[PDB]
Amino acid sequence: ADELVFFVNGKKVVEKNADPETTLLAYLRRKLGLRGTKLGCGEGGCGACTVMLSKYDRLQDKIIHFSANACLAPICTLHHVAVTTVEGIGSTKTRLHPVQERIAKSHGSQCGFCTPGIVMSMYTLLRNQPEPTVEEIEDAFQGNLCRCTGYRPILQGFRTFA
Amino acid sequence: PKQLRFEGERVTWIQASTLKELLDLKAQHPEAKLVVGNTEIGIEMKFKNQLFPMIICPAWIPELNAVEHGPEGISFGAACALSSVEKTLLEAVAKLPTQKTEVFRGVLEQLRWFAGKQVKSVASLGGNIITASPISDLNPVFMASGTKLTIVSRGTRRTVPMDHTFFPSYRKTLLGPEEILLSIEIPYSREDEFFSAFKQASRREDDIAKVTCGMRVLFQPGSMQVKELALCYGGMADRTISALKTTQKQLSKFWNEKLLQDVCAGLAEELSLSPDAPGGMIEFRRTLTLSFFFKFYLTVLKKLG
Amino acid sequence: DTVGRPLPHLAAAMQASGEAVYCDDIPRYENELFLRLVTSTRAHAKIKSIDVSEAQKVPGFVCFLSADDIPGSNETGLFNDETVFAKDTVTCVGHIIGAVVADTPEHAERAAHVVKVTYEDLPAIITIEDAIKNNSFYGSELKIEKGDLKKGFSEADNVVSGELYIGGQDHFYLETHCTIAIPKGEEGEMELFVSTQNAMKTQSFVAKMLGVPVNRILVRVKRMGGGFGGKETRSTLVSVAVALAAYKTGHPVRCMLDRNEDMLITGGRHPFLARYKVGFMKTGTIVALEVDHYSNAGNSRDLSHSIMERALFHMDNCYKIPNIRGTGRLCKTNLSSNTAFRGFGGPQALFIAENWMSEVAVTCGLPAEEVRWKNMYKEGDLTHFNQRLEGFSVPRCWDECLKSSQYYARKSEVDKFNKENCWKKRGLCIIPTKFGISFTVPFLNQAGALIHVYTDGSVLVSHGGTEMGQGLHTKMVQVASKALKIPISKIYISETSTNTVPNSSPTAASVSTDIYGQAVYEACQTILKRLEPFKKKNPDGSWEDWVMAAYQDRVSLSTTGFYRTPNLGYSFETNSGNAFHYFTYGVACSEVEIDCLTGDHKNLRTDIVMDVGSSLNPAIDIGQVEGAFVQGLGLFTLEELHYSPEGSLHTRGPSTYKIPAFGSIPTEFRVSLLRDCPNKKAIYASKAVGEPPLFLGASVFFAIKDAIRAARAQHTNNNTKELFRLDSPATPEKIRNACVDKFTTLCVTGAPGNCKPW
Ligand SMILES: Cc1cc2nc3c(=O)[nH]c(=O)nc-3n(C[C@H](O)[C@H](O)[C@H](O)COP(=O)(O)OP(=O)(O)OC[C@H]3O[C@@H](n4cnc5c(N)ncnc54)[C@H](O)[C@@H]3O)c2cc1C
Ligand SMILES: Nc1nc2c(c(=O)[nH]1)N[C@H]1C(S)=C(S)[C@@H](COP(=O)(O)O)O[C@H]1N2
Ligand SMILES: Cc1nc(=O)[nH]c2[nH]cnc12
Ligand code: MOS
Ligand code: FES
Ligand code: FES
Ligand SMILES: [Ca+2]
């Protein structure tokens, strides 16, 4: 029985008895106590559980950064992968990330349940493209639902990054 | 990388480091589920209560992750993410001349309002194809284009073009039990070859009744006379199907209003839905199979002149 | 004083960082267990056996709960017509039968699917048409009826009659239903943390099920990740079962519903069938009107009767109808009980209104703005239920919207586009709304607050309203700060709890800001009176000085407030007395482009002018206009719930059920709050804003209809006075099938015809 080793916000995780059936969302919320990442559907559709994943791409040099749905990612696929959650990019206790700060001051968050995933979708874009186009910004959120805002204020807060 | 083995309450997961390992694992355990993105297996397990007691994850294997340019097209390993396929084809499309990228731009059109960045960054090419959902948006494009599939078991290797026979039954492919999908070559389009792909806005049932297609015509050189014609559809049966009776009739006919009429006659009849057909929208679905061909018909006349 | 200022939501930054705690983000006790509901897979059946042998061997497996485990009462629901757990018969597909308790949520799910229920089917009634035909209704016919109906119809140049269906809607709050129940071990005591808009009825129904006094049961609500009406009552289906688990095990128990359970079980917006008949002049002035409404209620009364009163109160939209009869029936069906959803019967009856209004205009061959404007109430008019319209501001909204949206110029560009385009069409439509402000059951227009000032001068405000994303707590803090004359930074609200404010009404009916703002304001005023001697003694001193002087002089710095909406009491017999305290008004103009070959459309541009009085927070208020409009656009165009013939929901997730997405919204999206329009009837000259702008989403629907009319002029026939039925939601299926042409047809084929034209 081999050890599964990954990172969550820069911190090594050694899981000595990984269960194949454990999703990453379950593991963050209930083993690691990191509950900013939300459950909205458990099926890939809403984005509430959006995280960033990083890994060394052996075929391209490059560490690559991309977004995933924590609700569908088996932790057993994540050996030597680095996970970044909403609590890994900033906090009110320390310093907010610009993504977090903008969505909040722009009236992009009402109930707030979708806000962590939208933040991590936006954060991922910017890790790949620090000067996105307005187009790239809108397409960043294809996988993220919000029931509250009607979307205008979110996209508007974020065009400041373009 | 060494092979890892995780063992749970009900499931054993082997993470294969090497192609050779996989083909041996799958020969010992032909039942074993390949998992790459889990964007399908996770849903089957959680919502359909499928237990698969053996999982191989072949995601580490280079070969399954290779992107190879070639004289006939661009090959992607089966474990490659749709985001990568998407990115590479966009570069192919910006770089190559319109007449070579007809099929590519069909893939991109299906990839456009497909899921979201999260799904595409993890969903594998090979997982879509072998999943064989009746409503797969890619498999109609792959079938209509004869996209070549390299299939390996331990000892054997073969490359087949995707055609109607690659999908015999519901949720089933024409890979033998010890076999895996290794790579997929999506072809350049030739001169006098035009391609379109379309999809239904609405989906409403879990794996049925969303109309989606790929449409390919090859003319005799410089001409408007049909040499080959493929029209393949998802969301009209329990699998991806080709309108084969209808398009056979048009070989050596010309691209005119009469062809338009005859293809609609053929499609209306050959893809006809019983009133009790799974998913309903019996009439909407029929209108779309014709309306999609008419958009293709008109696009192809624009390309001809 | 931050009143009138665009202050970000108080929790926004913590919501951004994932530090805001929702109910499942609360830490587990070391012993805390997990509940999973067991639910009917049949519409109507007898339960023959339950068998828990396989769930029993499922690792950490604790127990299965059923009707027999309940210490007090199995009778529940707003009208005492539901079971906590079904005993002898099941009456809908998500009907809760029992519950598995286990040590992890994973183990509780595993055990729940392997519980074997054996059934014997019974005749089921699913559609409104099944219920109409079996005479399967709850209660008697509600009715409103003014003027002379045959006399209006006799004087009528034109009479049009018809039928319309409007589909239901899932709330799709991003956070599903969730309760944590902690049993204390002493005297029946229990402490619950729930995602609910109704802490009072949670507290009551838990107490009733347990057979314990209400004073034993504490309910706490920090926030919800959305409610939209669906956590007004049906939250208790989870809350009550989790409490029994807690009772029975002695351990803390929690449940968060998965999306697919949430949509099956917890109910949605009411589908409506209407049969209508209008009588009108050649000018398009309406003279008679009769509408029979049928709601699909589902398997329990819930808020069904009250949704129908609000329906009937809105069947006029903004239109003076001198002779007018509206009726309503609630159909009793073997579907999950339907409930409150932002709008509460108003969107449905207003959509019926706007549909016949659209038919009148087409029948008369007149421009639709003019027929609507012509028929609009003026200041001071009475409505069909006899309440007068003071500060009736829809004409300013109309004017300003007509002008700001450049409607008349865009009208020509839409015509031009349709003369030049064959297989794509555009539509443009300006639509009004008025929505009546107050709960329809008068006794709910009551609000309490408790305010404490601590000896450092810091203020803790508690009120009976809950936060679900709508900025209530932000607005209450803005008010307290204005009323007390201290910085917002000195004021905090923590949560809502039945031990700080008892007997509260649901945070519903858009009135929370009005009524809790009024209660909070009165607490502040009593605190200011108690402080005034010390202010008098030390006028150039500080709040902190005075608060300490009042403490050291043994003056209390804790006080209740309360508020009662005055002059309410509409009677159905007699048909008189005020139903509402006032009305919120707005106007939306929307343009679309349809693809006549596919059914797709783009929302091209929308302009909205809303009257919200003097806004407390114009950022929160424009955000309410925006989200409300987009849930309306979802209702009328995207969101479609679909069932099997045998009553089972097919659409149980985001992959089969389509709420608006980032790319769904109008490319050009403008909301304006009407200027210089203070409301004397509510707190600081403000108006309710929550549910009112949702119906304005219909402006996209009537824009799509107009774009279908244009497609049908092109390819289907030549009569420009044609009336074709378009039900809601206008999906791609409905949009495409209405665009009758050579494909629909097949006249290409050919053919023969047709209608199809050639
Ligand atoms: C929210 C959401 C929306 C989606 N929308 C769309 C859509 O609009 N259109 C569309 O087409 N799809 C859509 N999908 C489906 C998605 O594209 C597929 O689920 C995905 O590509 C499957 O890839 P995977 O790597 O996740 O496969 P997995 O779930 O890991 O595996 C799926 C199947 O493929 C098999 N498999 C994988 N690799 C191989 C191999 N090399 N050889 C043999 N078998 C193999 C496995 O054994 C298994 O049966 C959506 C999915 C989600 C979650
Ligand atoms: N973000 C958000 N806004 C929302 C809701 C919600 O759940 N989330 N509910 C709406 C509904 S249905 C109503 S009645 C009001 C209720 O609160 P209020 O009375 O303070 O507006 O908020 C509206 N706006
Ligand atoms: C309970 C209730 N009564 C009303 O009159 N209007 C409402 N809107 C939302 N909920 C309600
Ligand atoms: O008044 Mo909103 O809760 S239906
Ligand atoms: S929880 Fe909805 S996408 Fe993961
Ligand atoms: S803010 Fe509530 S879902 Fe986005
Ligand atoms: Ca309703």
Kindly write down the DSSP assignment for every residue of C534-582, as one continuous string: HHHH-TTS-HHHHHHHHHHTT---EEEEEEE--S---BTTTTBS-S-SE
| CA distances to A48, C7, C14, C19 from A91, in Å | 18, 20, 8, 8
Q: How far is Cα C270 from Cα C169, in angstroms, rounded to an integer? A: 8
Kindly report the backbone phi and psi dihedral angles of residue C672, in degrees, each rounded to the nearest multiple of 5, phi listed first: -130, 135
Last residue of a domain, one of A53, A85, A117: A85
Contact C638, C170 (CB under 8 A): no
Listed in sequence order, the residues at least 6 apart from B27 whose beta carbon sits closer than 8 Å to its beta carbon are B153, B154, B178
Same domain, C67 and C108: yes
Q: What separation, in Å, do the N-terminal and C-terminal C-alpha atoms of chain A show? A: 48
Q: How far is Cα C37 from Cα C336, in angstroms, rounded to an integer? A: 15
Same domain, A79 and A125: no
A140 touches chain B (CB under 8 A): yes
Last residue of a domain, one of B13, B30, B63: B63
Contact C377, C433 (CB under 8 A): no
Contact C613, C682 (CB under 8 A): yes
Q: How far is Cα C17 from Cα C12, in angstroms, rounded to an integer? A: 9
CA-based nearest residue in chain C for residue A103? C16
Same domain, C101 and C128: no
Q: How far is Cα C135 from Cα B172, in angstroms, rounded to an integer? A: 48
Task: Provide the CB-side half-sphere exposure for C8 (13 A, CA).
Answer: 18
- Spatial strand order of the sheet with C33-39 comes to C61-65, C96-102, C33-39, C253-256, C178-183, C190-194, C217-221, C496-497
Contact B184, B107 (CB under 8 A): no
Q: What separation, in Å, do the N-terminal and C-terminal C-alpha atoms of chain B show? A: 55
Same domain, B52 and B88: no
Same domain, B105 and B12: no
Contact C446, C488 (CB under 8 A): no
The H or E element containing residue B93 is helix B82-95
Residue in A110, A120, A141, A151 to alter for ligand 6 test, most ligand atoms within 8 A of Cβ: A110
Same domain, A64 and A97: no
Same domain, C600 and C700: yes
State the Cα torsion C731-C732-C733-C734 to the nearest 10°. Answer: 60
Ligand 6 center–CA C197 separation, angstroms: 16
Counting beta carbons within 10 angstroms of the beta carbon of residue C14, is it exposed (0 to 12), middle (13 to 18) or buried (19 or more)? buried
Task: List the helix and strand counts (H, then E) for chain C.
Answer: 19, 26
Residue B261's CATH number:
3.30.390.50
The size of the A-B interface in CB pairs under 8 A is 102
Ligand 1 center–CA B194 separation, angstroms: 28
Same domain, B75 and B185: yes
CB neighbourhood size of C532 (10 A): 12
CB neighbourhood size of C591 (10 A): 28
Same domain, B182 and B68: yes
Q: Is residue C23 part of a domain?
A: no
Residue C252 DSSP label: -
State the Cα torsion A150-A152-A157-A162 to the nearest 10°. Answer: 130
Same domain, A47 and A62: yes
Return the structure tokens found at C448.
């309490």
Q: Is residue C25 part of a domain?
A: no
Q: How far is Cα C721 from Cα C359, in angstroms, rounded to an integer? A: 9
Same domain, C631 and C724: yes
Residue C597 DSSP label: T
Q: Is residue C16 part of a domain?
A: no
Same domain, C259 and C342: no
Residue C131 CA to its chain's centroid (Å) = 24
Contact C704, C567 (CB under 8 A): no
CB neighbourhood size of B289 (10 A): 25
- Tally of structural domains, chain C: 5
Same domain, C616 and C708: yes
Same domain, B231 and B138: no
Same domain, A8 and A81: yes
Residue in B34, B44, B61 to alter for ligand 1 test, most ligand atoms within 8 A of Cβ: B34
Q: Is residue C44 part of a domain?
A: yes
Q: How far is Cα C409 from Cα C407, in angstroms, rounded to an integer? A: 6
Last residue of a domain, one of C84, C104, C123: C123
Q: How far is Cα B10 from Cα B15, in angstroms, rounded to an integer? A: 17
- Tally of structural domains, chain A: 2
Range C697-730 burial, b when 16+ CB lie within 10 A, else e: bbbbbbbbbbbbbbbbbbbbeeeeeeeeebebbb
Known binding positions of C for Mo-molybdopterin: 197, 228, 342, 509
Report the DSSP beta bridge partners of residue B214. Answer: B197, B232
CB neighbourhood size of C56 (10 A): 14
Contacts of A79 in chain B (CB under 8 A): 4, 15
Angle among Cα B140, B144, B150 to the nearest 5 degrees reads: 85
Same domain, B41 and B76: no
Q: How far is Cα C223 from Cα C227, in angstroms, rounded to an integer? A: 10
Contacts of B200 in chain C (CB under 8 A): 598-599, 732
Return the structure tokens found at A139.
């397409």
Residue C107's CATH number:
3.90.1170.50
Q: Which long-range contacts (C-beta less than 8 Å, at least 24 apart) are formed by C103-106?
A: C103/C33, C103/C34, C103/C60, C103/C61, C103/C62, C104/A30, C104/C34, C104/C60, C105/C34, C105/C36, C105/C256, C106/A21, C106/A26
Ramachandran bin of C641, using left for φ above 0, alpha for ψ from -120 to 50, beta for the remaining angles: beta
Return the structure tokens found at C539.
């006028």
Distance (Å) from the alpha carbon of A111 to chain B's nearest alpha carbon: 23
**What is the DSSP track for B99-131?**
GG-HHHHHHHHHHHTSS-HHHHTT-BHHHHHHH
Tell me the residue range of the domain where C517 lies: 441-580
Q: How far is Cα C215 from Cα A23, in angstroms, rounded to an integer? A: 41
Closest C-alpha to A150, from C469, C729, C224: C469
Identity at C180, one-letter amino acid code: I
Question: Helix crossing, C512-537 with C472-484: angle to 10°?
Answer: 30
Continuous H helices in C18-148: 105-112, 128-134
Same domain, A73 and A145: no
Closest C-alpha to C177, from C193, C195, C201: C195
Last residue of a domain, one of A85, A110, A135: A85
Same domain, A103 and A44: no
Please state whether beta strands B73-77 and B180-187 pair in parallel, antiparallel, or not at all (unpaired).
antiparallel
Interface of A with B in 104-123 (CB under 8 A): 121
Residue C217's CATH number:
3.30.365.10
Residue in C232, C440, C441, C444 to alter for ligand 4 test, most ligand atoms within 8 A of Cβ: C232
CA-based nearest residue in chain A for residue C624? A149
Same domain, B116 and B220: no
Contact B191, B227 (CB under 8 A): no
Same domain, C117 and C131: no
For residue C756, whether the previous peptide bond is cis, meaning omega lies within 30 degrees of 0, is: yes
Same domain, C591 and C737: yes
CB neighbourhood size of C544 (10 A): 14
CB neighbourhood size of C430 (10 A): 22
State the Cα torsion C626-C631-C635-C640 to the nearest 10°. Answer: 140
**What is the DSSP track for A29-77?**
IIIS---SSPPS-SSSSS-TTEEEEEEE-TTSSSEEEEEEETTT-BGGG
Q: How far is Cα C89 from Cα A26, in angstroms, rounded to an integer? A: 36
Task: Provide the CB-side half-sphere exposure for C368 (13 A, CA).
Answer: 23
**What is the DSSP track for B178-226?**
T-EEEEEEEEPP-TTEEEEEEE-S---SSSS---EEEEEEEESTTSSBE
Residue C197 DSSP label: S
- Spatial strand order of the sheet with C491-492 comes to C491-492, C459-463, C446-453, C558-564
Same domain, C47 and C36: yes
Q: Specify the residue with its C-alpha closest to ligand 3, atom 5.
A: C439
Same domain, B204 and B289: yes
| CA distances to C155, C356, C539 from C277, in Å | 14, 8, 69
Same domain, A4 and A80: yes
Same domain, A66 and A122: no
Report the DSSP beta bridge partners of residue C317. Answer: none
Please state whether beta strands B54-57 and B33-34 pair in parallel, antiparallel, or not at all (unpaired).
parallel
Closest C-alpha to B232, from B213, B253, B260: B213
Tell me the residue range of the domain where A17 lies: 1-85
Residue A9's CATH number:
3.10.20.30
Counting beta carbons within 10 angstroms of the beta carbon of residue C554, is it exposed (0 to 12), middle (13 to 18) or buried (19 or more)? exposed
Same domain, A1 and A74: yes
| CA distances to B65, C42, C82, C332 from C299, in Å | 53, 13, 8, 6
- Against chain C, the chains showing at least 3 CB pairs within 8 Å are A, B
Same domain, B108 and B223: no
- Tally of structural domains, chain B: 3
Q: How far is Cα C109 from Cα C118, in angstroms, rounded to an integer? A: 19
CB neighbourhood size of B287 (10 A): 25
Assign B85 to helix, strand or coil: helix
Last residue of a domain, one of B163, B189, B215: B189
Same domain, A2 and A39: yes
Listed in sequence order, the residues at least 6 apart from C49 whose beta carbon sits closer than 8 Å to its beta carbon are C116, C117, C118
Please state whether beta strands B54-57 and B12-15 pair in parallel, antiparallel, or not at all (unpaired).
parallel
Contact B115, B153 (CB under 8 A): no
Counting beta carbons within 10 angstroms of the beta carbon of residue C129, is it exposed (0 to 12), middle (13 to 18) or buried (19 or more)? middle
Q: How far is Cα C718 from Cα B50, in angstroms, rounded to an integer? A: 56
Q: How far is Cα C237 from Cα C542, in angstroms, rounded to an integer? A: 50
Residue C501 DSSP label: S
Contact C672, C495 (CB under 8 A): no
Last residue of a domain, one of A32, A52, A85: A85
CA-based nearest residue in chain A for residue C23? A35
Kindly report the backbone phi and psi dihedral angles of residue C203, in degrees, each rounded to the nearest multiple of 5, phi listed first: -60, -45
Contact C1, C482 (CB under 8 A): yes
Same domain, A58 and A94: no
* Residue tagged 């049932």 (tokens): B205
Method: X-ray
Report the DSSP beta bridge partners of residue C589. Answer: C430, C607
Assign B271 to helix, strand or coil: coil
Three-state SS letters, C289-316: EEEEEEEEEECCCCCHHHHHHHHHCCCC
Contact C235, C198 (CB under 8 A): yes
Known binding positions of B for FAD: 34-41, 114, 124-128, 137, 181, 199
CB neighbourhood size of A105 (10 A): 16
Last residue of a domain, one of C86, C101, C123: C123
Tell me the residue range of the domain where B12 lies: 1-63
Q: Is residue C519 part of a domain?
A: yes
- Spatial strand order of the sheet with C324-332 comes to C142-146, C324-332, C286-298, C272-280, C158-166
Same domain, B82 and B182: yes
Return the structure tokens found at C366.
């007149």
Q: How far is Cα C209 from Cα C344, in angstroms, rounded to an integer? A: 28
Maximum distance among all Cα pairs of chain B, rounded to whole angstroms = 64
Q: How far is Cα B302 from Cα B254, in angstroms, rounded to an integer? A: 15
Residue B106's CATH number:
3.30.465.10
Distance (Å) from the alpha carbon of C192 to chain B's nearest alpha carbon: 29
Closest C-alpha to B189, from B218, B224, B154, B156: B218
The H or E element containing residue C35 is strand C33-39
The H or E element containing residue C605 is strand C601-611
Kindly report the backbone phi and psi dihedral angles of residue C247, in degrees, each rounded to the nearest multiple of 5, phi listed first: -55, -45
Q: How far is Cα C467 from Cα C684, in angstroms, rounded to an integer? A: 20
Q: Is residue C18 part of a domain?
A: no
Assign C259 to helix, strand or coil: helix
Closest C-alpha to C624, from C399, C420, C471, C452: C471
Report the DSSP beta bridge partners of residue C422. Answer: none
Say whether C17 and A96 touch across the interface (CB within 8 A). Answer: yes
Q: Specify the residue with its C-alpha closest to ligand 3, atom 9.
A: C509
Same domain, C428 and C470: no
Contact C46, C89 (CB under 8 A): yes
Return the structure tokens found at C604.
């091209």
Same domain, A69 and A2: yes
Same domain, B106 and B145: yes
Q: How far is Cα C209 from Cα C205, in angstroms, rounded to an integer? A: 6
The H or E element containing residue C75 is strand C75-76
Q: Specify the residue with its C-alpha closest to ligand 3, atom 7.
A: C509
Contact C60, C102 (CB under 8 A): yes
Assign C483 to helix, strand or coil: helix
Question: Helix crossing, C394-404 with C407-420: angle to 10°?
Answer: 50
Same domain, C646 and C706: yes
Return the structure tokens found at C518.
């009024």
